[PDB]
Symmetry: C3
Subunit: 442 residues, 3 copies
């Protein structure tokens, strides 16, 4: 039934296109001048509503799916599957970062152009920042792993601010911990996996609880169906709002065309050559067919700019349409969302290479390897914190000591490049799931 | 067994009467002068303890009751029942507001009297307020519906504060969202209903989870029995404390006797003529008998001044004493608590008409319809936020542009009129439940 | 199998000893000068990680264990068991406080010595404090009992701050309530016990839910096994960090040797004479054998300085190694953690007697009884709040009006005496559990 099967894909693609058209027409016809902030809020509000709906269920779906997936195969096979999955995610993120270096080095987006100016963008506010240390970031990562409280971890994460409690002499900023807002999805993932392993360690005592969590996840999936049918309206209004919030006639594109083209080309090459090649090599099945199987979550990722929020739609589509195993999907895809960020590592490395290319920095071999490794680690470093969309580049440049004086340049265009990132991240998650499904099948 | 059956009703009526007597005697004998703030806190503390007990269980009871009630009848009948229930609540709230207009217009409580003075009450602090817009209130309503996180929604709700982030020129206050304290009971209600529909959409997978939630609610009901047996002491001490906290020899009654009489008469006429007439018309069963069946929750509502807190006692009494169906009770009465506020719409409209009557405003037909509709919507607008006992009148007067210069007059007497409101709200909920029980039975 | 059975006890004792050796060697070899704050954080971080792991599971384990234990015996036997348990805890805490008086009165640690000076310790900051009233502390105790919301009670507790809302004349600080951080484990304990009683009041409806909670606790116990195998590393690094954080060559020991010896001797006499004597008297079974059965939780208590955090390890060890009944363990030991603080009452009373001994206060009989009773109540008073490690001594001295001018003396050495306190508290809990197991068996 092609007509009914492909209705959703048609609807979300039409939603994205019509949202772009609506926003461009509104901005050309007057935009904010004809709109006002109140009508801007009402115009963006369906987008915020879709993101509120999809952030409501990631906690149930992630927790109960991992508990229902971990306790479906014995811990030996689970350990092997988790290890090969982490290896796959690490390799894909590393390949993405290397592709970013190879593109930004060649196209040279940091050539002398309008982007050389940065007074308007920075205006002295770029240097002023928390300036989180790399060690403190890794410690906050390993403290969001192994949370102090599960309930608080359902909406809070650990962030190490810096006070000035060294009045005795030579004032040095000292760390203090204070829980902030944002889900600790990594901690919940680890707790859930460990829980499911514990239930598999038990036998008849755990059958009730596995049945509970599987039923709960199936109910949440039934909610996901209806959220999916709502999603095109939210995507349309969200995209229209996010191109009405700033003019996009071509001024910022004319400013940063090489950088944005480098990022989008890197994302497409990662998402249409590298990972499809890996899938074909390993499972020997049509990767582009599979990519068409998941267009609706990809479009939702482009519209939402949030990997965790698109995940319920993705797990529904992957388990339903494509012939991916239910337990493998449950175990892999949430872990893919919180660890695999191919696009994030890609455009972080490309941004670093761009800001280094302007001012003519060297970056011969050692610094290249450094940016690769720290991008690969920051793939998960940025994952626990939702606020740090591109904030993690500052700590990278602190590690390797580059000019952070114009990091605010990307914040004007973060809302565009970070969407293709989300597309590629969920794509890499699904491809890892398919590969590991075939590996477990063999 | 009349002697044992009616013991609780006797006990709570005696508790209210003895609390009034105790508070009046203490205030006459010296009150605070003989008491001190520390003994005032210890004297009110049983009231705070009862409210802490009854706010502990509304989350379990509401969530699990709606999940156990929604998934007891098919979604078609559920949709019809929900639609006729919302229609009933809307009509009753609208009739209440019209009754408020009809009374305040006739009795004319805003005649020239001591209430004309407002310097002592306002003293310039009335105008200073957040001044929340109507659109922003509706957006916060629809964002507390569809919460971002369920756990946070168990004790937090979305409130749009206003910052001054327009330093570029012509400083205009802009909205920012920051979650504040207070349960998001509307969001939990909607999520729970949707969940129960999902479990009914499933079949054998959901039987475990329905059995879980029904067992959990029955346990919470067993707690409610013991809280009910404690409740008269809390009501007595609470009422005594809340008339010791301000002198009530008759000064404020002598000031606002017409307004308070208008509100109480409107509440009694709504609760003893209109809704009993509707019940008799539809189900043809003794409505006043049924009203006597629920005296203990009504007295608890008068003592507590909180509709959500009396709800566990109400659902216990309605399912136990009166022959109302268990599933219909579960589905309707929580929704009645968070949506139906007949008394709130009533005294909000009466307060508006009173402040308009002083200063001799017109309010011919269009403004009357405006106050009716905005009161009907604010019935649920005030429901998500517990702090806004009468705060929502300011946004109404912002919509229709009346003198808010003396809104602080009612805050001295909010603690009295708002209790009969709670009585009428729970009464309207129970009457809707009885009507819809008979409709489903037919 | 002695070699495998005793491996854990050997490992944690070796961990404590090696941590002491590591910290002393690091402090002697340069300590902070060779370390820096960043490496100090990385060196302490395994300790923080162990405490984050053990605070993650006390909520599941406590809640589900009490629900699974309360609903294993009928409410009559439960009421008797709870009453005799509270009587036992009260008597043991009182005996501990009397032992503290008897030791501090005899050894006279407040003799004229270096400890007479307090300018360096206090420096005027001792008097400045919230100065919480005793009545307000008891009210906050009874409001953390019977929480307003269960979810918030999973990570928040009620603390009555004091504002200055008496500008009308004679500015007097007035209480305001605002929820702060810290688990409301007492409120969750009471709610859980009451819930389990409700499920036992029900019959077949509750079997599912009891099976759920028992399965959930068994899963959490399976997590506890692995946390236990990790624990020695955390204890070693934590102890090393907490003796590197301050020099302990003997300066503070040379300052307060009599006071610390009094506290440790009181703890050992309570833990090795009084309670073993009671156990032998009642159950007639080798108490020192039983004490050896639980060395790993005792060492964890010494390392962690947290009674609640060691509790999962304790309940695992008591149910596994020693022949204590599962249901009795579940019901008693969590209640022991939140109520029984023998060591806390002990060193609080000893600290009071020490600060009274300096400056030559009388403390004849009435004040002795007062310190005993308020210490016995503050055993649970300090339990709800985790921040108040020794903060509760100030409110005691407010009750009985002693010099609080040098309360900051103990804060330098709170990290040492408060560890043996934790050891004795968990010891008293386990001994009460064994006694009541034998009583129920008889
Ligand atoms: O850390 C993240 O990733 C960054 C790198 N790529 C971008 C992406 O694709 O998300 C962002 C992140 C994840 C999720 C959310 C999120 C947003 C709305 C609602 C709920 C959650 C934000 C930030
Ligand atoms: O918004 C509400 O309604 C207003 C209009 N009528 C009044 C009523 O009857 O409650 C108030 C509201 C509901 C519930 C609480 C509440 C109070 C204590 C504890 C827990 C909850 C407060 C305010
Ligand atoms: O109030 C308490 O007791 C005091 C008297 N003796 C001391 C003890 O043995 O704990 C402290 C308390 C309990 C538990 C924690 C706690 C610490 C870390 C992580 C989680 C929790 C703190 C303070």
């Amino acid at each position: 039934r092609c007509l009914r099967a492909n209705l959703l894909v048609l609807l979300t693609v039409v939603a994205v296109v019509a949202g772009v058209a609506l926003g461009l027409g509104v901005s050309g016809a007057g935009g904010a001048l004809a709109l006002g902030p109140e009508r801007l809020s009402a115009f963006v509000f369906p987008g915020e509503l879709l993101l509120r709906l999809l952030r409501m269920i990631i906690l149930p779906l992630v927790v109960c799916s991992l508990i229902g997936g971990a306790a479906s195969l014995d811990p030996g096979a689970l350990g092997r599957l988790g290890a090969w999955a982490l290896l796959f995610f690490l390799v894909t993120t590393l390949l993405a970062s290397a592709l970013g270096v190879g593109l930004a080095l060649a196209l040279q987006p940091g050539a002398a152009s309008a982007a050389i100016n940065a007074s308007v963008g920075a205006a002295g506010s770029a240097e002023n920042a928390p300036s989180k240390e790399v060690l403190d970031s890794f410690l906050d990562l390993a403290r969001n792993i192994f949370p102090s409280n599960l309930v608080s971890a359902a909406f809070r994460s650990y962030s190490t601010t810096y006070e000035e409690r060294n009045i005795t002499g030579t004032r040095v900023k000292v760390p203090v911990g204070q829980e902030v807002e944002g889900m600790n999805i990594l901690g919940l993932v680890v707790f859930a996996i460990v829980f499911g392993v514990a239930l598999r360690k038990l036998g008849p005592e755990g059958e009730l609880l596995i049945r509970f969590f599987n039923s709960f996840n199936e109910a949440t999936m039934v909610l996901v169906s209806w959220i999916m049918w709502y999603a095109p309206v939210g995507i349309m209004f969200l995209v229209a709002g996010k191109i009405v919030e700033m003019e996009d006639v071509g001024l910022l594109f004319a400013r940063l065309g090489k950088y944005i083209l480098c990022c989008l080309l890197g994302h497409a090459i990662h998402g249409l050559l590298v990972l499809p090649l890996i899938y074909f090599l390993f499972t020997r099945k049509n990767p582009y067919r599979f990519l068409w199987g998941i267009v609706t979550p990809l479009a939702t990722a482009f519209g939402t700019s949030s990997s965790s929020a698109t995940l319920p739609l993705m797990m529904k589509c992957v388990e339903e349409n494509n012939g991916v195993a239910k337990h493998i999907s449950r175990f892999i895809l949430p872990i893919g969302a919180t660890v695999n960020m191919d696009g994030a590592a890609l455009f972080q490395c490309v941004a670093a290479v761009f800001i280094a290319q302007l001012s003519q920095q060297s970056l011969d071999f050692v610094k290249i390897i450094t940016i690769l490794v720290t991008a690969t680690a920051s793939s998960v470093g940025a994952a626990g914190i939702p606020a740090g969309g591109v904030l993690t580049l500052a700590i990278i440049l602190e590690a390797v000591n580059l000019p952070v004086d114009h990091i605010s340049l990307i914040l004007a265009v973060d809302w565009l490049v970070d969407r293709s990132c989300t597309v590629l991240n969920v794509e890499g998650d699904a491809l890892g799931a398919g590969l590991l499904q075939n590996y477990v099948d063999r």
